[PDB]
Amino acid sequence: AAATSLVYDTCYVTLTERATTSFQRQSFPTLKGMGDRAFQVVAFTIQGVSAAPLMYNARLYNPGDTDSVHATGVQLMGTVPRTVRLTPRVGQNNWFFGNTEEAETILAIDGLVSTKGANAPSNTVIVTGCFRLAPSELQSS
Amino acid sequence: AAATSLVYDTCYVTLTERATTSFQRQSFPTLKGMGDRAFQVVAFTIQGVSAAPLMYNARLYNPGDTDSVHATGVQLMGTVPRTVRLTPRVGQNNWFFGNTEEAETILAIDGLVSTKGANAPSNTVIVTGCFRLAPSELQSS
Amino acid sequence: AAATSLVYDTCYVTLTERATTSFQRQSFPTLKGMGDRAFQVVAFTIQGVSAAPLMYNARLYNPGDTDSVHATGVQLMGTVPRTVRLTPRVGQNNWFFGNTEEAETILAIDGLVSTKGANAPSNTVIVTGCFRLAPSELQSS
Amino acid sequence: AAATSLVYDTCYVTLTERATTSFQRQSFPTLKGMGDRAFQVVAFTIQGVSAAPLMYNARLYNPGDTDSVHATGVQLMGTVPRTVRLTPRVGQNNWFFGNTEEAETILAIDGLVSTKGANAPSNTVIVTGCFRLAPSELQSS
Amino acid sequence: AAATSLVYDTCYVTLTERATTSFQRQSFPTLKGMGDRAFQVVAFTIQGVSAAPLMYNARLYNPGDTDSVHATGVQLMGTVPRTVRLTPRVGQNNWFFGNTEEAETILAIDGLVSTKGANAPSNTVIVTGCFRLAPSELQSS
Amino acid sequence: AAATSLVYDTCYVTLTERATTSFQRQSFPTLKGMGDRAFQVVAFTIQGVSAAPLMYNARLYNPGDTDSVHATGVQLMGTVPRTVRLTPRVGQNNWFFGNTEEAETILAIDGLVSTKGANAPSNTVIVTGCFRLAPSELQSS
Amino acid sequence: AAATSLVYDTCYVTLTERATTSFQRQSFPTLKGMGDRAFQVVAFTIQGVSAAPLMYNARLYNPGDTDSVHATGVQLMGTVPRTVRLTPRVGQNNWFFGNTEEAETILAIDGLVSTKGANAPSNTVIVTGCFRLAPSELQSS
Amino acid sequence: AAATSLVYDTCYVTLTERATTSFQRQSFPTLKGMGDRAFQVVAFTIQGVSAAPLMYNARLYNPGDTDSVHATGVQLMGTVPRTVRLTPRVGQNNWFFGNTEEAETILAIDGLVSTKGANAPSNTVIVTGCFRLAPSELQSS
């Protein structure tokens, strides 16, 4: 019997008006280089500052889905950091197997503007994931 | 943070002796036209009347499965409405992502006869689903 | 007996100085495409950010009224999201019948400026409605 | 001060496959001939027998609406009486003023079939309303 | 969030034998000049003195109704003030939107005589309304 | 005996650097058009946003005074709404008689700058008064 | 309503140094011949004896995954039976639908050696699965 | 030590007037294909619908008996499903060894008519068995 580990990884980014920013396995330091060991999304924390009015929407993906099974819903962005926590419930947190490709999408954050055609002001978003890890699937000699 | 909504949708149908009736996303009014927002099956209620002896079997599908992961098992049909409730347990209720195709199967109900080659008498079945809905995955301007 | 469903829908917008933004049935994704089934306003949540000083006033309409029966009263807008909740009491929440036209007004938000003739700075408003839904009024075959 | 009266009225009918049966003020004996005194729907009880499989859907109207604000949802009909009770909640029970026209619709019951083009078998439906009555609006001499 | 105000307004009148006296928005001082802000009837108090036998009947109207949804029922009038209180229950107190026309009817009081063709003796009636007020629907600059 | 009513009225404004903005009877919708009925200041709520550093000072006047008997003291203004409540104690809340002139001053708000000769940046202030109202002083026929 | 059955199935094997032994649906007697009825992994018990030092690693697969979502982690093997229990948590136990192919992988056990190129000594492993079974998806006549 | 499994299997049928329908090992999906592992009857549930008056009698057999050691006794059949549960007590539930032949009889249901020579109307019967299973009797390599 080998106990499950728990880790917090974190990348960040600047959002773009009519675009979606993808956070894949490679986006999270530890997950990117931990090797062949499965993992699961426990919770995600999203902090966000924008120089001017601006919205976003963080969406959690299940492994191999073409679209997100969970989301935070549009969030406003002020000139001050504001945090939102996304938590998957049953059926929104299937485990990603050990060999999940580096480019696999985990969390995607859409950028949105309320005035047609407008462009996103300066803005930053810090995304922190909380993941469980099953035992390493080691190689024999 | 945006709370999960809960909705009851309902279609119906006449079953056919050696056929399976599929209830897809489009079969449920609200789900059909709610747009890009994920959902999950909470419970299903099946009512059924048959003019003569006749059986059926409601089966719950997970998203994208070729076969059902849960079922009610064959049920008899009398000349009076009789209700059965199907409830998914963990692993039988994965969430369907927001962009799930309209033709995706959710619940399938097989029609059965106990005498070889016989045909199904007049019969109706009312199917009501209970679904959870994640936040809408809106578009930017 | 068929239980009432509860749903959260949400659109957003940029307000204009001496104009009123109308949120009609079509403005809410689920309501827009759920078909012929009545609904009622439970509560409305309004979040708002403005790049510079700016006011607004959300007003709830009863079905078919020429004017709003409830309102939040003018609200100030800062460079940071600030939420206000509008809740109808008895007589301010009559049900909208199933066939309510898509263009029917539910919530209207006026934009206001404190200096004569001034124009509204960049601003966004996220509006979330909480609605009850009566059973679907289905068609026969 | 004059206390509110409470009355139970009741008509019945045979439903038709792709038609809607309207129960108007005139359909209820007492309401039809009580004169100029307002009233309100408290509850409705619907009993139903059908010689063969058949569905129906009772829908409550508010005064002067073009469509129903409440409904029971489709109900199955067996060869034995089965009762359903419809109860309006706030916003679904506005009072009908004393001079409400005899032809005003209160409850409408749709008839439905699960097989395209089929016809409704023998069937009866007993509808009982429970209404509150405000004081009579009498005439002077 | 802006709290609801509560106000007591009051007009009076002499009743006429086979006539109905209408108390419209303009009849109540504050309501007449408060501007664009919705309101609701909480309770009405009616005091009445008559030099000789005489009856009356106060009736509450919902907004835009052609007839009253509530009433006190005929009341006798003595040579001494006698008060009656009319209180709307759910469905008899819908809110009047902010722009309700000044001539809109709220309470109507019928005058009645027990002897055919007789005329009403000297009489006065003091009517006091209790109303809730939603926030003012202000104009922008 | 006629109970005292309680009302919330509200106007707003943009402040000017070395000027005082007066809120008179006419500035409050209901008070402006309620007619001949006395009133008293219960409390005042002042919200304020400023695009840049800026101060203000709300001062309550007694009826007919040449200067304010109460004040909030200078308040700072940030890029986010900040509320302050002014409440009169005994001797600072004398009643204004029914015929108080429309131009009578109730609350005055001074605008202030910390750098000599500087000008006030964009700014808005929402002022809400809470007033008690004595019975209407009606006219005879 | 038909209750879920619970079954224990068990196969065994000799592990090979740099190879992975797959336990598919066919490997478990009952599952192999039970027909079209879905099932789920509850727990797995692995017993193991090795004539000389030797390691192994049991890994649980979700249905249709290319890699395992759970594992026991490398385990040592002595000259005496030693048991380890593998239990899936949420997201590691999705149900396998009724028509799951006989060759579908459920549990895979890797064989490992600590000295490069060495070969595995005599060894046996007994694997017992605990599975839940949904109702049979029967055929009509 | 290996725990006993518990399974629910279920077949169905149309009964014939003066005939006995046998449910053998092969009639139950799981039992038919589970291989060499003994089992025992825990309980049997029998549901039954008949288009017209008709009787039946379910009888439990011990392994290898020429006649049933337990029975439900004649049961009436209505136009509505009616369930009966048969439970063996000690001496009526001997275990069937692993190699029990597929054609071995477990439960037999006689069809009966109350009028001499009459024929059975349309009818269906759903039979569900509850069985305990001893460990599999596996083969060596």
Swiss-Prot record, chains A, B, C, D, E, F, G, H:
Disulfide bonds: none annotated. It is found in: Virion. InterPro entries: Satellite_virus_coat, Satellite_virus_coat_sf. The keyword Phosphoprotein does not apply. GO terms for cellular component: viral capsid. Keywords: Capsid protein, Virion. One of its GO terms (molecular function) is structural molecule activity. It holds the Pfam family Potex_coat. The keyword GTP-binding does not apply. This is Coat protein.
